[PDB]
Amino acid sequence: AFYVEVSRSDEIQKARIQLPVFGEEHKIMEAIHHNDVVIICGETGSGKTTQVPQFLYEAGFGAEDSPDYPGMVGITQPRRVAAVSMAERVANELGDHGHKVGYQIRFDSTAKEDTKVKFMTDGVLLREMMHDFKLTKYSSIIIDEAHERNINTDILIGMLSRCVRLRAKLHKENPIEHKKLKLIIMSATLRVSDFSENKTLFPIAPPVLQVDARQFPVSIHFNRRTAFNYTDEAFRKTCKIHQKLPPGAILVFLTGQQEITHMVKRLRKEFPFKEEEEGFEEVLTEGQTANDPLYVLPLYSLLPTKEQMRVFQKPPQGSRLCIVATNVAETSLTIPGVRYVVDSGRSKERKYNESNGVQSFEVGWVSKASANQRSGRAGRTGPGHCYRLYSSAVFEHDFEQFSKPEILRMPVESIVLQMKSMAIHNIINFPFPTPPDRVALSKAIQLLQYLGALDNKEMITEDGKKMSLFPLSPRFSKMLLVSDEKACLPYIVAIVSALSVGDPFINEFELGPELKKELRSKFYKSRSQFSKLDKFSDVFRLLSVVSAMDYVPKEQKEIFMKKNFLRGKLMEEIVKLRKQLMYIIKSNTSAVVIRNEDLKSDIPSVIQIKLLKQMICAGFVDHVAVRADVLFPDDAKITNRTSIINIPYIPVLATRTPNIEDCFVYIHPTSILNNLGEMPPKYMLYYSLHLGGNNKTRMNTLCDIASTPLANIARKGLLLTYSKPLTGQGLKTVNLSPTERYCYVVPRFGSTVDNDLKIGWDLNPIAVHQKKQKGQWTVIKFITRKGFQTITGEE
């Protein structure tokens, strides 16, 4: 009721007083009492994850005798293992009340009667809000690890902002029947402005509580210049610190495991056991040399627990601890005695942009906020130093102020489909902590209707639910749904994995003197080995290389990448994704274990590659470009002599301008299409459009598509209108009743002749089966020339 008396052992209680959050109990509880929403900032090691549910439990949260907080305390974690290990920790810590702690890591499981403090995943809470949005079961909700900005955590916070508001309104109407809901958002960092200062999320700003003790100052040292070889500059800087500066451990921030492993051994080999620069004014203390040993250790998420745990050990006497890490060391447990940070200023992050034609997983500059978080790592135990391996001008102009959340680095239609499967109806006005653009949101809902994932009322369909089962862009999930025809499924999973991961082919990002011409000969010979399936499709060049990979032995892999100018990491990743999709497909046809041998396939037949282009079309129906001379010959200025990269194309649904040349897109010089001795295809399917270096928009081409296959896909994809029945020789309308007919129509793809400020075009005349439904003729199916001839013969 008022308070709950918990009995803990002296060992357990003394361990709790040591935690930085322990003394913050009264400030935290004063904020919760006066505010329905509270934001708590404290690093990992502060104890806020394990202590705040206990502070609530002790104040009467979850107590049946409580007139205010009878409901449970719910705590989300972004990972299943974190929720279980956290529940285990708090159960021990709560002593004689330890039986009141539980976890939920499945939707299936029903909680135990004594569970009053429940640790779960975001997914479990999201599912619970589908069954009961009000979450009447809870008195409180703690959203931990909110600085990660995971897409489902952001949706959950958005949903909860509305839930807390409604719980507040119902409580004001009837405090007996309706209880308050306490929302606590937790962050390892101070970067909470997208939660605290967002008025759509929180109209009245919630208090932000700082639980950490104050840090020590850190002197920031920029380099005069920004070195291209940053691992070389990082190695150089690390050695200079070790050889010249007083005691204190070193922390190096690199981008990945291979850079780490290479530097770790380069440093171990440099300091083994038995002009003018900033930040080198300090000298070595007595009993310290320039050639002392360096105890080097790697630090990355993939390392085994026993290897990760070594970063906390004191280095051997007479040596210096040097940690070589990725951004895991940005918000991890405090590595003791660090007074030197070597910052490369970069990280490998997945980027994706709308209207910009961006899709990358690569090394780029980090935000100013991440650079500062890296810097502050040197001032945890005492005043430290940070060595930035870039200039202050590059920092100021090339580093963005803030790090981009996941919701802005992932396809907008993936976010919309995920929300729609959760029965979140109004997307346009959803209170996102960081909202995607309204135009992009509107475009994502329309795309989903073209893919059949949402119906005419914008509700999730049966196909949309199946597509939501894959960790893929709905374009790719659509392709999978239509692929199980004439055994094309293994080919589509291969294409979809390759397109999803990125382009493994290295192009003339190298040489396009005598040695340069010699390498182009090997380049083109390699490129032509994967161009054998179709002469128009860059997508089957991907299928060929991915299919070749499966027949290459593990030892020979590296030379296979070298001979063929291939991104090895990308090829390994495609094999990983194909196995993950194969696991999902097989697991939905009822334990499943996919091996490298299950991925091996034979060459697709002529019928199969025709069908695959149509399956690609289903996922990319709004991404068709017509050869400009079929629409605007005078403006196109295409001769039989024009080069392939100079022949313009017009994307369907492109917005018209006074000058049609504004709508022109062109074949990329790296495309298979450049080897054509003929006029390129009338209709081309494209992955994406890129605003090129020569100021020309270039198509990232997939494959060609013929008129009738495009018509079939555009009919199901709702991008077709038809003309009135055609009149002509052997074209005559055959009426089965005044409500049923078979006739020839001209299909209109995309946009009508009348609506000429958006690009559309006519397809080849086609035989059609039509039924007069609600006073208007509707196309039931397309008919072949032979099919039509038999119907005209039957009548």
Within 10 Å of residue 400's Cβ, how many Cβ atoms?
13
With binding defined as CB under 5 A, does residue 508 bind Cl ion?
A: no
Q: How far apart are CA 198 and CA 779, in angstroms?
A: 49
Tokens representing residue 417 in the block: 């489909």
With binding defined as CB under 5 A, does residue 750 bind Cl ion?
A: no
Q: How far apart are CA 747 and CA 718, in angstroms?
A: 12
Task: Provide the minimum distance between the beta carbon of 668 and Cl ion in the complex, in angstroms, as a whole number.
Answer: 4
With binding defined as CB under 5 A, does residue 538 bind Cl ion?
A: yes
Task: Provide the minimum distance between the beta carbon of 458 and Mg ion in the complex, in angstroms, as a whole number.
Answer: 7
Question: How far is C-alpha 80 from the chain's CA centre?
Answer: 19
Task: Provide the minimum distance between the beta carbon of 445 and Mg ion in the complex, in angstroms, as a whole number.
Answer: 7
With binding defined as CB under 5 A, does residue 437 bind Cl ion?
A: yes
Q: How far apart are CA 255 and CA 370, in angstroms?
A: 13
Task: Provide the minimum distance between the beta carbon of 452 and Mg ion in the complex, in angstroms, as a whole number.
Answer: 12
List Cα–Cα distances, 382 to 215, 218, 221, 377, in angstroms.
Answer: 8, 9, 17, 10
Residues 79-118 as x/- pattern, contact with Cl ion by CB under 5 A = -----------------------xx---------------
Under a CB-based contact definition with an 8 Å cutoff, are residues 544 and 532 in contact?
yes
The option from Cl ion, Mg ion, none interacting with 437 (CB < 5 to 8 A, set by class) reads Cl ion
Interface residue with Cl ion, options 527, 668, 715, 748 (CB under 5 A): 668
Three-state helix/strand/coil letters over 105-151: CCCCCCCCCCCCEEEEEHHHHHHHHHHCCCCCCEEEEEECCHHHCCH
Tokens representing residue 160 in the block: 């909860």
Nearest CA to 72 out of 122, 117, 129 is that of: 117
| β-bridge mates for residue 342, sequence order | 252, 387
Task: Provide the minimum distance between the beta carbon of 618 and Mg ion in the complex, in angstroms, as a whole number.
Answer: 18
Compare residues 148 and 503 and give the one whose CB is closer to Cl ion. 503
Q: How far apart are CA 86 and CA 52, in angstroms?
A: 12
Tokens representing residue 265 in the block: 């051994």
Interface residue with Cl ion, options 436, 604, 648, 680 (CB under 5 A): 436
- Segment near Cl ion (CB under 5 A); pick from 117-125, 134-142, 375-383, 699-707: 699-707
Compare residues 446 and 721 and give the one whose CB is closer to Mg ion. 446
Site size with Cl ion, rule: CB under 5 A = 11
| β-bridge mates for residue 362, sequence order | 349
Task: Provide the minimum distance between the beta carbon of 717 and Mg ion in the complex, in angstroms, as a whole number.
Answer: 12
The option from Mg ion, Cl ion, none interacting with 668 (CB < 5 to 8 A, set by class) reads Cl ion
What is the sign of the dihedral through the CA atoms of 570, 576, 578 and 581? negative
Tokens representing residue 443 in the block: 């475009």
Q: How far apart are CA 483 and CA 492, in angstroms?
A: 6
Task: Provide the minimum distance between the beta carbon of 436 and Cl ion in the complex, in angstroms, as a whole number.
Answer: 3
Compare residues 444 and 625 and give the one whose CB is closer to Mg ion. 444
Within 10 Å of residue 228's Cβ, how many Cβ atoms?
7
Task: Provide the minimum distance between the beta carbon of 466 and Mg ion in the complex, in angstroms, as a whole number.
Answer: 21
With binding defined as CB under 5 A, does residue 671 bind Cl ion?
A: yes
Q: Please indicate if the annotation marks 44 as binding a ligand.
A: yes
Contacts with Mg ion, residue ranges (CB under 5 A): 446, 449
Q: Please indicate if the annotation marks 406 as binding a ligand.
A: no
Q: Please indicate if the annotation marks 305 as binding a ligand.
A: no
Compare residues 437 and 508 and give the one whose CB is closer to Mg ion. 437
| β-bridge mates for residue 295, sequence order | 321
Compare residues 447 and 624 and give the one whose CB is closer to Mg ion. 447
Compare residues 547 and 701 and give the one whose CB is closer to Cl ion. 701
Question: How far is C-alpha 615 from the chain's CA centre?
Answer: 24
Place of tokens 């009245």: 204
Compare residues 252 and 539 and give the one whose CB is closer to Cl ion. 539
- Segment near Cl ion (CB under 5 A); pick from 176-184, 325-333, 537-545, 564-572: 537-545
Q: Please indicate if the annotation marks 62 as binding a ligand.
A: no
Task: Provide the minimum distance between the beta carbon of 184 and Cl ion in the complex, in angstroms, as a whole number.
Answer: 21
Q: Please indicate if the annotation marks 47 as binding a ligand.
A: yes
- Segment near Cl ion (CB under 5 A); pick from 27-35, 617-625, 631-639, 695-703: 695-703
Q: Please indicate if the annotation marks 692 as binding a ligand.
A: no
What is the sign of the dihedral through the CA atoms of 578, 580, 586 and 589? negative
Compare residues 261 and 449 and give the one whose CB is closer to Mg ion. 449
Under a CB-based contact definition with an 8 Å cutoff, are residues 143 and 129 in contact?
no
Q: Phi and psi dihedrals of 138, rounded to 5?
A: -105, 150
Under a CB-based contact definition with an 8 Å cutoff, are residues 257 and 327 in contact?
no
The interface with Cl ion within residues 49-78 (CB under 5 A) comprises none
Q: Please indicate if the annotation marks 46 as binding a ligand.
A: yes
Task: Provide the minimum distance between the beta carbon of 271 and Cl ion in the complex, in angstroms, as a whole number.
Answer: 47
Tokens representing residue 384 in the block: 């430290």
Q: Please indicate if the annotation marks 48 as binding a ligand.
A: yes
Under a CB-based contact definition with an 8 Å cutoff, are residues 653 and 629 in contact?
no
Residues 607-646 as x/- pattern, contact with Cl ion by CB under 5 A = ----------------------------------------
Residues making up the binding site: 42-49
User: Contact residues for Cl ion (CB under 5 A)?
Assistant: 102-103, 436-437, 440, 538-539, 668, 671, 700-701
Residues making up the binding site for ATP: 42-49
